[PDB]
Design a protein around this motif. Structure first.
Motif, PDB file in Angstrom:
ATOM      1  N   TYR A  84       0.854  -1.093   0.103  1.00 19.04           N
ATOM      2  CA  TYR A  84       0.092   0.095  -0.079  1.00 19.04           C
ATOM      3  C   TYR A  84       0.800   1.265   0.050  1.00 19.04           C
ATOM      4  O   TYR A  84       1.931   1.149   0.448  1.00 19.04           O
ATOM      5  CB  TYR A  84      -1.058  -0.230   1.259  1.00 19.04           C
ATOM      6  N   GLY A 182      -5.984  -1.589   9.382  1.00 19.86           N
ATOM      7  CA  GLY A 182      -6.429  -1.593   8.145  1.00 19.86           C
ATOM      8  C   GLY A 182      -7.264  -2.991   7.879  1.00 19.86           C
ATOM      9  O   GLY A 182      -7.578  -3.871   8.929  1.00 19.86           O
ATOM     10  N   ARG A 194      -9.399  -5.544  -2.626  1.00 19.46           N
ATOM     11  CA  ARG A 194      -9.522  -4.312  -1.735  1.00 19.46           C
ATOM     12  C   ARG A 194      -8.736  -4.377  -0.517  1.00 19.46           C
ATOM     13  O   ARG A 194      -8.808  -5.384   0.125  1.00 19.46           O
ATOM     14  CB  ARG A 194     -10.889  -3.952  -1.983  1.00 19.46           C
ATOM     15  N   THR A 195      -7.807  -3.239  -0.242  1.00 25.16           N
ATOM     16  CA  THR A 195      -7.286  -3.008   1.053  1.00 25.16           C
ATOM     17  C   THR A 195      -7.684  -1.443   1.312  1.00 25.16           C
ATOM     18  O   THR A 195      -7.751  -0.684   0.494  1.00 25.16           O
ATOM     19  CB  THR A 195      -5.908  -3.578   0.877  1.00 25.16           C
ATOM     20  N   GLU A 196      -7.844  -1.248   2.475  1.00 25.96           N
ATOM     21  CA  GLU A 196      -7.885   0.132   3.309  1.00 25.96           C
ATOM     22  C   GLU A 196      -6.919   0.072   4.467  1.00 25.96           C
ATOM     23  O   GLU A 196      -6.700  -0.598   5.313  1.00 25.96           O
ATOM     24  CB  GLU A 196      -9.390   0.058   3.686  1.00 25.96           C
ATOM     25  N   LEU A 204      -9.124   7.390   6.970  1.00 25.96           N
ATOM     26  CA  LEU A 204      -8.466   6.551   5.912  1.00 25.96           C
ATOM     27  C   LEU A 204      -7.405   7.223   5.191  1.00 25.96           C
ATOM     28  O   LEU A 204      -7.253   8.391   4.949  1.00 25.96           O
ATOM     29  CB  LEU A 204      -9.547   6.259   4.935  1.00 25.96           C
ATOM     30  N   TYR A 207      -6.139   3.203   0.186  1.00 28.24           N
ATOM     31  CA  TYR A 207      -6.710   2.193  -0.302  1.00 28.24           C
ATOM     32  C   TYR A 207      -6.129   1.471  -1.478  1.00 28.24           C
ATOM     33  O   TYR A 207      -5.318   2.289  -2.088  1.00 28.24           O
ATOM     34  CB  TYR A 207      -8.096   2.269  -0.256  1.00 28.24           C
TER      35      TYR A 207
END
Length: 214
Positions: A84, A182, A194-196, A204, A207
């Protein structure tokens, strides 16, 4: 022996994940490819190549990642959790991460228990291959299963497992420990969809989304 593989497992398969900031600006392009697939009696093993480039196209990191099934459980190198912008921006090609394989539970499996699910922890070290005095500790802990949900990205629609983790980043240079958390959405034979990534104040920061898969 049945084992759901939460990563591409077909030789020559290519995919692209893109990393964005909170506002939606492209930070990093993450290109992957399945180089080798091996079927062992204990389970399957997959080796994939990756190239992380910034939006202009210049290389920021390159390496390989291993994924495997061993007696009904799926594992992936914990460096995939750090795919990320927050980590990848802090990178040049001399930057490496210590090997630590962590499990990814299968919530679709027979009699899966959302209330009793074990997760491996990760405590890796991100360092400069040429100057190992230049390093950072990153602890991925308190991993928990949230739910299963359908996610739509430009690559398609996927039934995922949503898992939360806590992160803590230590450095010889900084005086304080930087904490956050996360989420990850991972689907069978795809891996991360998907990743956050959030800070200690639930803001946030970045992402990632799966944009291509062929």
């Amino acid at each position: 022996q049945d084992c759901t593989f939460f990563f591409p497992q077909t030789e020559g398969t290519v995919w692209v994940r893109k990393g964005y900031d909170a506002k939606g600006n492209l930070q990093s392009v993450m290109s992957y490819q399945v180089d080798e697939v091996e079927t062992l009696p204990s389970g399957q093993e997959v080796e994939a190549d990756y190239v992380y480039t910034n939006p202009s196209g210049t290389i920021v990191n390159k390496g390989d990642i291993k994924a495997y099934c061993q007696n009904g459980e799926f594992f992936l190198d914990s460096k995939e959790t750090l795919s990320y912008p927050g980590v990848v921006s802090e990178m040049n090609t001399n930057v490496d991460i210590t090997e630590n394989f962590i499990n990814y539970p299968n919530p679709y499996a027979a009699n899966f228990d959302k209330n009793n699910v074990y997760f491996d922890e990760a405590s890796v070290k991100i360092y400069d291959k040429k100057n190992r005095k230049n390093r950072k500790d990153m602890a991925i802990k308190d991993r928990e299963f949230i739910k299963t949900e359908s996610i739509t990205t430009p690559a398609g629609t996927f039934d995922c497992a949503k898992v939360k983790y806590n992160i803590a980043t230590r450095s010889p240079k900084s005086k304080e420990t930087i904490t956050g958390y996360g989420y990850e959405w991972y689907s069978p034979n795809v891996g991360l969809v998907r990743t956050e990534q959030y800070d200690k104040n639930n803001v946030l920061q970045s992402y990632t989304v799966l944009e291509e898969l062929k």
